[PDB]
Design a protein around this nucleic acid. Sequence first.
RNA 1: CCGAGCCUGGUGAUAGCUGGUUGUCCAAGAUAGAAUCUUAGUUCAACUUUAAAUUUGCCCACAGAACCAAAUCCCCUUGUAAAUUUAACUGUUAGUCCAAAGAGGAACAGCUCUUUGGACACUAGGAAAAAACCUUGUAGAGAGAGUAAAAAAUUUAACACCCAUAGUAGGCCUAAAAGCAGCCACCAAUUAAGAAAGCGUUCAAGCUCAACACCAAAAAUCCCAAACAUAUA
RNA 2: GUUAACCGUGCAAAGGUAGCAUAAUCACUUGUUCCUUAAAUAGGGACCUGUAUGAAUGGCUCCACGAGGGUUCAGCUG
RNA 3: ACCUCGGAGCAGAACCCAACCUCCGAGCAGUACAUGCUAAGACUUCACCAGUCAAAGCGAACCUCAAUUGAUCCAAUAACUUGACCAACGGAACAAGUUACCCUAGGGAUAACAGCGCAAUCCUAUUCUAGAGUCCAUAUCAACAAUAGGGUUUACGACCUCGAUGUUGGAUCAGGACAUCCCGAUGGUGCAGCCGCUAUUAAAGGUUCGUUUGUUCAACGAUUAAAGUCCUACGUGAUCUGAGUUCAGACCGGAGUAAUCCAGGUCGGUUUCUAUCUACUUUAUUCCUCCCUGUACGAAAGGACAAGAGAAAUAAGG
RNA 4: AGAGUGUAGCUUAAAAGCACCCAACUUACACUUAGGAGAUUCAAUUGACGCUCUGA
RNA 5: GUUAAUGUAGCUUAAAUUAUCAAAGCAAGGCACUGAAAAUGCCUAGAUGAGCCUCACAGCUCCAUUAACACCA
Lengths: 205, 111, 115, 131, 120
Amino acid sequence: KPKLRFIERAPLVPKVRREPKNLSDIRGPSTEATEFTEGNFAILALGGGYLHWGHFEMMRLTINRSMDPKNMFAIWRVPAPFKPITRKSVGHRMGGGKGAIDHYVTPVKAGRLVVEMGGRCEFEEVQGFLDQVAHKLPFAAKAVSRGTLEKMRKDQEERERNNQNPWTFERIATANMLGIRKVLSPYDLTHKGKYWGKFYMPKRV
Amino acid sequence: SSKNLGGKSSGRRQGIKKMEGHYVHAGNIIATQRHFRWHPGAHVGVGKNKCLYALEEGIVRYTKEVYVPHPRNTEAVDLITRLPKGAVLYKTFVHVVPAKPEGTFKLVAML
Amino acid sequence: RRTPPLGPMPNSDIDLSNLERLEKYRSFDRYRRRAEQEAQAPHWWRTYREYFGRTQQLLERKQAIQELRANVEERAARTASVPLDAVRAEWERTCGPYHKQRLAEYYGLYRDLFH
Amino acid sequence: YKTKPTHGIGKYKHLIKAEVRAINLGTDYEYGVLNIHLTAYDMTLAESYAQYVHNLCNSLSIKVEESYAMPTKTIEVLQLQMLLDSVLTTHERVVQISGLSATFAEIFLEIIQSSLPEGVRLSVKEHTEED
Amino acid sequence: KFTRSRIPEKVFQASPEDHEKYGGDPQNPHKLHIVTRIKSTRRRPYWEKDIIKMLGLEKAHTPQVHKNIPSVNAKLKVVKHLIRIKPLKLPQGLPAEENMSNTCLKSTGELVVQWHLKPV
RNA sequence: CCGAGCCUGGUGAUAGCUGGUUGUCCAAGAUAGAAUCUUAGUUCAACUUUAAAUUUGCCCACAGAACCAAAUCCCCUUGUAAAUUUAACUGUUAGUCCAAAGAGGAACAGCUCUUUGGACACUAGGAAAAAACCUUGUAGAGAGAGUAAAAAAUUUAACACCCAUAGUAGGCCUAAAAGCAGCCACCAAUUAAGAAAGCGUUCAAGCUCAACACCAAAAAUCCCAAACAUAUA
RNA sequence: GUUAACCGUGCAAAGGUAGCAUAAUCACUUGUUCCUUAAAUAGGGACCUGUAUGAAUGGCUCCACGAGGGUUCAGCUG
RNA sequence: ACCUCGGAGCAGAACCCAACCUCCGAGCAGUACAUGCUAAGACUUCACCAGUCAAAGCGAACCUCAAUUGAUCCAAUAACUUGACCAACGGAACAAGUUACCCUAGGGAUAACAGCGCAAUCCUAUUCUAGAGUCCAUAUCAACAAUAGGGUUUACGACCUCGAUGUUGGAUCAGGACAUCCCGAUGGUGCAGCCGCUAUUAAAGGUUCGUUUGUUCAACGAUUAAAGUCCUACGUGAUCUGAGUUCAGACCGGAGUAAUCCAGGUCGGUUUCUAUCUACUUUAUUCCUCCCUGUACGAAAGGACAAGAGAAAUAAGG
RNA sequence: AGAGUGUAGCUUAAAAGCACCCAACUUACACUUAGGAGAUUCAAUUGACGCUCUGA
RNA sequence: GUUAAUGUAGCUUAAAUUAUCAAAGCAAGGCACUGAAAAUGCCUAGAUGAGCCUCACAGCUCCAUUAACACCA
Ligand SMILES: [Mg+2]
Ligand SMILES: [Mg+2]
Ligand SMILES: [Mg+2]
Ligand SMILES: [Mg+2]
Ligand SMILES: [Mg+2]
Ligand SMILES: [Mg+2]
Ligand SMILES: [Mg+2]
Ligand SMILES: [Mg+2]
Ligand SMILES: [Mg+2]
Ligand SMILES: [Mg+2]
Ligand SMILES: [Mg+2]
Ligand SMILES: [Mg+2]
Ligand SMILES: [Mg+2]
Ligand SMILES: [Mg+2]
Ligand SMILES: [Mg+2]
Ligand SMILES: [Mg+2]
Ligand SMILES: [Mg+2]
Ligand SMILES: [Mg+2]
Ligand SMILES: [Mg+2]
Ligand SMILES: [Mg+2]
Ligand SMILES: [Mg+2]
Ligand SMILES: [Mg+2]
Ligand SMILES: [Mg+2]
Ligand SMILES: [Mg+2]
Ligand SMILES: [Mg+2]
Ligand SMILES: [Mg+2]
Ligand SMILES: [Mg+2]
């Protein structure tokens, strides 16, 4: 049914064991749902980050207000918040074990499609309200069509052939030119030089 | 509060002691383990805590052989009888190729 | 790091989606027959074996068993003797020399006699 | 180098198995859990046909999952015709089935039909029962 | 963690364009290296501090010859950011026993065998 | 100067605590951990020192190491000159920051806790000043020379011009919804203007558009080098 | 349970009685109302969840008295 | 709350690896009675002590489980052996509270005050168009959020200082910030006027007196053009105060057998310094009155600006 | 009429191995144990019978 | 906020488990009606989510709710 369903905070099975904050759940490119499945229009993540339930009901209400339910349909490409964030009650000194579970987040890597759309208009009709959604997300994001995503991957690939600088990041980091791997990660090999922490730089070759 | 308590056990120091291609006298402990990782092969014994020792003075090699268990081993004969018919199991084994010939015939007298 | 296998990985032709439909060993001994076939294969990886390694004849035999199926009366089945000395003379003529070559190799005559 | 180009050489769990309707649209309905009920006034003849069914299914590689028995009926001469009394009893037994096609459906019924002995009744159905 | 880095062998395949920018050729390769240390070994790990002593490059900017065999190349591959490798090309032949006494290396790597101090 | 006087004596009480430890000259020298009424300490180990004995030690290649990522281990060659063992000991055993993989916390801290690797407590140059970043080490005299690292780059939002009459006061549904309160429909006169896309009606008119034609910064004593776009790397 | 004289029930050696009280008396509390002042977290008089008052651990008034601790009229005075 | 031992993660692939880190468990039960004796070689929980494995041989047959535990000395015993929840688990053979009457040795290795770091909490500005504002997002207020900032609060950290960095409020004198309370200038207004709201600009000048409270606060009285927000070692104690806080005395209630204790109350309680050096030690605002005028405005109630005149007061200098 | 050919079910088996069948255990199945059954379409690589094809 | 405890018929003790008695309430019952008396039956997810067993049951997960504590500068 062609609106977004209600994403509930805190799924009905609770998590009981407190997991560590792995922040490799934000780093680098996404290998999860990078592609369009039965839709044409989306919000591409251009940086990593966590989504609250607050960002979900941001994304749910400000689409359903500004979307014709007879000509458009939407679908989530992200799950419910499953990853539990542990917050100690304020005013206490350090020590005393891990705190309690406060809220749940869902991790979103960069390059992941967030909210897919589709229906009987062209991209300039949905570009308006999807951009104010993508701007309010807790990471840089972009309202992409099914054509612009290929016309940005076309542009990001010809950019890698055109550069007149002999030195790319791959040729230097993998071959360990300056002893430069002393100041890089082991993720700096296969990410590229593009990704840096949570942030993804689309300008950079 | 830290309700969790007890995990102060130290490391077991369990692993291969004599790696592949080593000369091993008869009785040296090739590996110590829990939860079988290397099974005994030719001239390799097993102790109570599943360690592997060498039964002859030789050179230790590691192969990948075919696993057929004992028909009294009831926890793993049912492991066989749910396999499809192309299947074999292929565990890994530790052998000792013995170096010294076990003796020579020598003149002791002229009688 | 992960490097690809050199030859055919085993158990690869049977890794099918329809697992429940497969023809499924139900006995120990059927597997022990298959598994002792694999320990004579080439095996690219590493093996213990590397370090430690007419027309009137069948026509007369056809009436032979048909004749011999009647004088056992199937009364000698549900405890016959099988005289060996006649059998031995039959063995020495026919499958003596094939068998005799084994012992001459197991005892290692040929690698001492004739190189 | 720990892993190797021989890694995964012994993996004994994707090969082995671990731990309604049959939807299958268009080709459609590939008959799922069906309880064929073998019922007789005898005991031996009912058992000898479940004997015949179960060996038939494994010969045709179509899956069976139960062979249990519905318990026994307790009726006399029903006193509907000096009023008569002698206890004649009925022995029912369940044979289940899980895999069937549309294209084996009418045929596999025939081998059950043609071989069905004297005084026994079948009844195919879906599943909502317990002993 | 910072570990002992390893180089893919794809880096040490020379292109035909590399045979244009540099004077060597794959057939008939040079026999000896000229290895001079141009970077200090401090602020670099102890394995690189120890390889430099094994090649014999305690002094920076001093020249040193090594064979071009794959074993000693496998020690130059770990300290290749500290050194300059040049092929020792001999314009004349090898120095004879009468011609050991007066040679010089002649950066551009040309071990001249009779080095006089007179103009041409 | 009384929570138990004062004096002499035991008494040079004792102090895992503090302070102090005096000629010259050179050489080697940075700390894995375990126990402990123990974490201000000590004992063993590790490391360091000296003197010996002997033979290999570092670097390492194919092969090799488990099922339920960077790498290490192993290891001949090879490059090199140490290494193990014996003897006699002390001291360190209250560490810091940087990069990397993580845990705790707020994906706070010049925060805390491990691991791998640097540097620092060791001189020198640079980053303004500077422990920890970068460059560099084995030592002297020189009124010589080549070098290394090494000086932040940016300045941005104008916009069409013109033209607008009719079914019709749209079946529907609503007091009333006539382009804009709501569904379905959305055909049609003129050459061309949507049963109307934004403003403006309780319902109506009006303004336009679509259509013809035309052609980024804020805080507390006083900003803070001076400056400078053009002679050849 | 009907704010409950009362009934129901448990426990106890006995269940704080007389008085007195927002006190020099945990906290809520600068409780509440009256008087005092133009204005009162002060003071004085009352009301009493004082749920941590209370009877020689002495309770409560009252005459004198105090370099005691609060408050006040008038006068006075840098 | 914990303290010894084992499994899993962190610690992904030899070993190792911390945490008042995340999770599970153990202080046995069962079967034997060759769970007999001896003995090459090895492993080892980073030491040691403890632990583990084991070929053969001799004698005979023909252990499972992960942890499942405890040293010396002393006991008990003819002997073999057996003795602690010695669990603070490498174990002193047997010992508690209290101290504000305190003392000594120390420590900025370690707290309170202050600085600094950080900004969760706070405070502000934008971006966003839901909702409010009759209608109308943007006169005004604003949710879900997003991006930057500030360093006033409560925190956190433990880097300087314990061979002393004196502390709350007030007095005295103020220095500065502008995110302006008043005075000035301007844009918008759901600005009719009087009054407001909001924003841009401005830090020259101004920012009252009282009752209760130890109070900064607040409440309240009367005012005023307004009674601003802060920083300055919560400015300033070698300038002052000591009422609070925080010594020894003491009651009251409470906790405790008592000593004594309580961020609970209350009476009382010594505030030293002769200045070496640095630094330093004489250069106009605002309100009200009258008038416009009872005008503009509204239509009425109400009621201004700008132009002019006249009085004052505070301040600086005499 | 033209064609592919041809080992019992199957077989880059050459008289083989699997499958298969009846009992005895099992609710049955499965396992196992005791048994049971069978093929080179026929004549000198040819020739000629069995099927499956392309025909009318 | 931390520990400490409690969890119940309509109300309350219980009973070391399988759950009672005594008011509640339901009616019948000594002849003018009610209270009292005494007497059938009636009134218990033993406050929760999981089943290792078997769980008021026994450890969690919990939710309520009660007492302690919420310092020393
Ligand atoms: Mg562990
Ligand atoms: Mg440990
Ligand atoms: Mg002394
Ligand atoms: Mg020295
Ligand atoms: Mg100490
Ligand atoms: Mg630190
Ligand atoms: Mg118009
Ligand atoms: Mg009180
Ligand atoms: Mg007074
Ligand atoms: Mg009394
Ligand atoms: Mg050891
Ligand atoms: Mg033995
Ligand atoms: Mg201990
Ligand atoms: Mg006192
Ligand atoms: Mg002292
Ligand atoms: Mg400190
Ligand atoms: Mg502080
Ligand atoms: Mg609204
Ligand atoms: Mg620290
Ligand atoms: Mg101090
Ligand atoms: Mg001093
Ligand atoms: Mg301003
Ligand atoms: Mg102060
Ligand atoms: Mg003073
Ligand atoms: Mg002062
Ligand atoms: Mg006095
Ligand atoms: Mg001075």
